[PDB]
Amino acid sequence: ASEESQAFQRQLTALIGYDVTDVSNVHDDELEFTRRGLVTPRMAEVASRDPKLYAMHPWVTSKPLPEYLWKKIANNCIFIVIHRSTTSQTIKVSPDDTPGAILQSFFTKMAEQDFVLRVCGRDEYLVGETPIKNFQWVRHCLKNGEEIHVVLDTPPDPALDEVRKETVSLWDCDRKFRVKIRGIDIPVTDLTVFVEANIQHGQQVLCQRRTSPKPFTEEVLWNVWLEFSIKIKDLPKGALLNLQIYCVQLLYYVNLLLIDHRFLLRRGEYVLHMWQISGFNADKLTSATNPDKENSMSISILLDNPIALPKEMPNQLRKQLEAIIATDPLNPLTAEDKELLWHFRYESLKHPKAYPKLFSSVKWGQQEIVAKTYQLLARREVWDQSALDVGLTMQLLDCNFSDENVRAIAVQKLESLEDDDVLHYLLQLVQAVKFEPYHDSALARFLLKRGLRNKRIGHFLFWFLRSEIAQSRHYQQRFAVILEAYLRGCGTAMLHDFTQQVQVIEMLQKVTLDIKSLSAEKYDVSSQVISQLKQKLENLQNSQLPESFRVPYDPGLKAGALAIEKCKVMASKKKPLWLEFKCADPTNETIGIIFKHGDDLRQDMLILQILRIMESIWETESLDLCLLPYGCISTGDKIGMIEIVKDATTIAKIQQSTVGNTGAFKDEVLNHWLKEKSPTEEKFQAAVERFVYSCAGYCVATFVLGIGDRHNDNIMITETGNLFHIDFGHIERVPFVLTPDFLFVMGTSGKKTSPHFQKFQDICVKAYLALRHHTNLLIILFSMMLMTGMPQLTSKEDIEYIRDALTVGKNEEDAKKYFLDQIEVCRDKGWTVQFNWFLHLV
Numbered sequence: 001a002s003e004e005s006q007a008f009q010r011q012l013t014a015l016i017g018y019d020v021t022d023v024s025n026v027h028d029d030e031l032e033f034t035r036r037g038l039v040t041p042r043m044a045e046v047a048s049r050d051p052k053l054y055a056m057h058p059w060v061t062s063k064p065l066p067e068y069l070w071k072k073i074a075n076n077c078i079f080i081v082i083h084r085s086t087t088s089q090t091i092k093v094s095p096d097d098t099p100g101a102i103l104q105s106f107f108t109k110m111a112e113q114d115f116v117l118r119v120c121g122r123d124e125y126l127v128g129e130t131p132i133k134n135f136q137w138v139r140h141c142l143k144n145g146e147e148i149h150v151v152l153d154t155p156p157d158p159a160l161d162e163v164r165k166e167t168v169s170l171w172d173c174d175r176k177f178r179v180k181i182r183g184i185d186i187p188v189t190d191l192t193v194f195v196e197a198n199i200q201h202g203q204q205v206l207c208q209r210r211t212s213p214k215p216f217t218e219e220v221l222w223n224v225w226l227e228f229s230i231k232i233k234d235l236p237k238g239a240l241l242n243l244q245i246y247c248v249q250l251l252y253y254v255n256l257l258l259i260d261h262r263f264l265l266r267r268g269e270y271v272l273h274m275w276q277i278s279g280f281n282a283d284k285l286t287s288a289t290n291p292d293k294e295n296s297m298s299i300s301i302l303l304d305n306p307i308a309l310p311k312e313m314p315n316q317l318r319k320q321l322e323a324i325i326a327t328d329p330l331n332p333l334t335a336e337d338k339e340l341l342w343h344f345r346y347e348s349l350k351h352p353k354a355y356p357k358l359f360s361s362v363k364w365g366q367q368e369i370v371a372k373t374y375q376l377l378a379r380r381e382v383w384d385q386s387a388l389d390v391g392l393t394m395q396l397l398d399c400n401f402s403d404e405n406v407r408a409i410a411v412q413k414l415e416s417l418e419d420d421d422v423l424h425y426l427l428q429l430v431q432a433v434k435f436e437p438y439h440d441s442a443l444a445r446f447l448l449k450r451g452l453r454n455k456r457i458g459h460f461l462f463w464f465l466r467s468e469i470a471q472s473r474h475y476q477q478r479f480a481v482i483l484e485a486y487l488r489g490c491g492t493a494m495l496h497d498f499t500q501q502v503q504v505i506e507m508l509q510k511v512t513l514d515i516k517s518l519s520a521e522k523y524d525v526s527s528q529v530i531s532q533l534k535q536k537l538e539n540l541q542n543s544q545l546p547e548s549f550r551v552p553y554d555p556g557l558k559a560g561a562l563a564i565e566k567c568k569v570m571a572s573k574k575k576p577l578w579l580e581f582k583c584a585d586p587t588n589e590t591i592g593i594i595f596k597h598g599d600d601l602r603q604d605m606l607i608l609q610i611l612r613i614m615e616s617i618w619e620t621e622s623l624d625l626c627l628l629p630y631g632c633i634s635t636g637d638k639i640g641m642i643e644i645v646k647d648a649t650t651i652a653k654i655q656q657s658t659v660g661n662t663g664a665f666k667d668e669v670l671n672h673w674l675k676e677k678s679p680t681e682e683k684f685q686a687a688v689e690r691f692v693y694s695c696a697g698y699c700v701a702t703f704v705l706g707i708g709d710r711h712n713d714n715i716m717i718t719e720t721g722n723l724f725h726i727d728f729g730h731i732e733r734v735p736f737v738l739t740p741d742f743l744f745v746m747g748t749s750g751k752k753t754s755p756h757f758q759k760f761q762d763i764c765v766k767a768y769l770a771l772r773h774h775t776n777l778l779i780i781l782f783s784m785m786l787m788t789g790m791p792q793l794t795s796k797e798d799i800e801y802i803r804d805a806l807t808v809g810k811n812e813e814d815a816k817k818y819f820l821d822q823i824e825v826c827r828d829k830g831w832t833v834q835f836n837w838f839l840h841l842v
């Protein structure tokens with residue numbers, strides 16, 4: 001209503017990248033009702049959260065301090081360098097010392113509580129009643145053997161985060177369901193079309209009726225009643241009326257929810273703008289209609305049937321039911337299996353791992369059965385009590401489940417995750433919103449309240465939602481209605497940082513797309529393209545870009561002015577921008593960021609998230625495989641950013657040092673580069689230990705994912721011997737890369753065993769074992785990222801690579817040999833595929 005409240009909605013639309021106050025693409029108030037419906041949990045969180053802790057966002061974890069990291073604390077007391085101006089005197093504190101206790105041990109050891117421990121060079125705070133061992137920044141320093149540098153700083157003002165003042169039933173109706181297909185209208189040789197109407201409940205198709213084929217014209221009228229066998233009483237909440245135009249080839253689709261957001265049966269006249277098939281995918285389930293009215297095929301339908309929706313086993317069969325529960329998520333159930341799970345549903349409820357299969361075997365098109373399922377769900381004693389299995393929880397949030405009650409018990413288990421884990425699974429929990437039948441949901445409300453509770457979760461939430469909105473027309477309506485709901489609770493300070501970030505990304509994306517236009521595809525980096533970049537960049541800095549911004553992939557870091565003398569264009573075919581920015585904290589080395597158009601960085605983000613999940617799985621088994629999970633955020637269509645890792649070099653560039661652009665690869669090349677880049681033999685004998693652990697980790701990780709066969713120009717290594725892979729936005733043969741240059745560093749010529757190669761295969765095989773223990777988790781993370789992120793998704797063979805790879809249904813002893821067989825494939829191949837990878841240049 002306020003004249004300035006209208007200017008707030010245009011700031012929101014600039015941050016979101018979509019106008020939520022738009023009704024040109026809706027046939028009901030589903031999104032408007034969701035906007036108002038979210039005010040309640042937004043305000044409950046904004047009110048619930050403590051302001052002094054929300055402002056300083058302490059990054060803690062309640063997981064035990066790992067064994068390898070404990071070895072670094074040999075004195076049961078670690079060093080903390082506290083700095084204030086000139087002062088820079090260290091302190092020895094016990095790992096059980098709260099930052100409050102370490103405050104009394106700094107003031108009493110000097111000659112008041114209004115000072116906090118802030119890390120040097122970042123906006124990261126060691127505050128709150130949590131032991132110093134549980135702070136992430138402390139654990140990060142103990143991993144990379146770095147010294148703890150803090151500052152006696154003034155705490156931020158919690159008032160900076162201020163917020164702006166914000167009839168019959170179905171079960172009585174015994175008639176059959178019907179829908180009149182009036183016609184189809186395309187704006188614009190000699191084929192036929194027919195329409196197919198389906199009653200769907202997630203994946204499962206309850207009923208199906210088609211029209212008679214009629215010639216392919218601009219307007220095709222039918223005016224026909226399609227009668228279905230399903231009674232109106234039997235329609236479940238979340239039932240979708242999928243209308244498809246077939247040429248026998250699917251050309252267009254559009255969904256419409258039979259039961260609306262108010263439990264009412266949908267009736268009336270509807271003119272639906274349809275999506276074209278690109279010439280399985282989460283986008284196929286979307287309730288949103290095609291916004292492009294000018295170029296899309298339309299379908300007009302009619303309904304009127306108000307009507308509202310109301311709210312002891314033998315050993316043999318036990319052995320069959322247990323065998324079924326044991327099988328992996330992708331093992332398909334048969335009618336025999338489904339029937340056995342249902343009849344013995346009370347036995348199945350006693351095992352929580354049998355939840356996805358028990359609910360996958362429910363007759364959803366039968367009111368009577370869904371009513372039994374809801375009574376069955378009330379006996380949730382086992383479920384509530386049970387330990388949180390995130391892998392199992394996520395199965396219940398995928399495409400196979402449209403049930404609000406089924407999906408909600410899963411969100412109830414997610415409320416147990418601490419911030420630390422909510423960050424690991426955030427990308428995936430965000431995509432799972434695509435599978436929710438309705439806009440307002442338990443999951444949406446869950447992501448909102450956690451983002452609003454923690455500024456680190458909030459920052460990442462923003463970038464993930466802003467990402468899908470900027471490259472998904474099927475879901476931008478839903479995700480923007482959730483991003484507005486968040487942005488209206490993060491508080492003024494966040495709303496300012498996001499504006500500066502969005503602004504910088506927008507300008508640099510323009511320059512990335514402009515430099516790509518200038519430098520031709522079949523063209524190297526000339527003097528024209530390099531000087532045009534420095535010219536374009538000077539005009540941005542001189543009055544059109546913020547003097548400061550938080551780094552999207554690492555928010556604790558604030559980047560400042562552009563070091564234009566250090567920026568350049570990369571030699572890749574996609575011509576990425578290598579940019580360097582000066583650090584914005586005085587507390588002169590820059591931040592390196594790569595901007596890139598051309599590759600799908602959602603696939604990059606989805607693999608990088610899985611590497612943090614994998615190294616977490618290992619951390620619990622007291623393993624550390626030094627994976628370098630560099631930052632990378634997708635910002636729109638094929639465009640996005642990548643973190644430049646300090647003093648790291650490509651493996652292919654290391655060999656084309658001894659001898660340049662040629663296929664004669666030496667083994668000693670990498671072994672020399674490591675010693676040449678090491679000051680003392682102590683630092684070189686460390687680089688081989690960082691190489692053995694990091695190398696073994698990337699071998700197992702890429703193998704389980706099916707991205708082990710990579711060109712060595714996409715494999716980098718640091719001067720400190722930390723190997724890492726880059727550019728995952730792509731996907732004879734090889735399982736993973738273990739080329740003879742790497743073996744030389746471990747001590748083996750080939751077909752030999754050295755003491756370090758022995759160390760390598762020991763951790764290598766123990767890491768495979770560790771991941772095999774979390775088979776269902778990896779299967780679901782990959783299975784879900786293919787439903788949403790990877791658009792070339794095969795719901796048959798693509799999804800099942802990880803099944804064969806993860807040694808399903810096999811003993812742990814065979815696995816040790818099988819993994820070592822794949823090690824020996826890389827021994828006999830040597831440089832066979834690496835040579836053919838170099839040959840892919842011409």
Ligand SMILES: Cc1nc(NC(=O)NCCOCCC(C)(C)C)sc1C#Cc1ccncc1
Pocket residue numbers: 576580589590591592593594596630642643644645646647648649716726727728
């Ligand atoms: C992840 C990553 N790190 C690198 N590090 C590096 O070049 N260091 C060289 C020296 O430090 C730079 C110096 C300073 C800026 C730190 C001050 S390049 C790279 C990549 C990539 C990529 C390309 C295409 N698609 C996806 C990913």
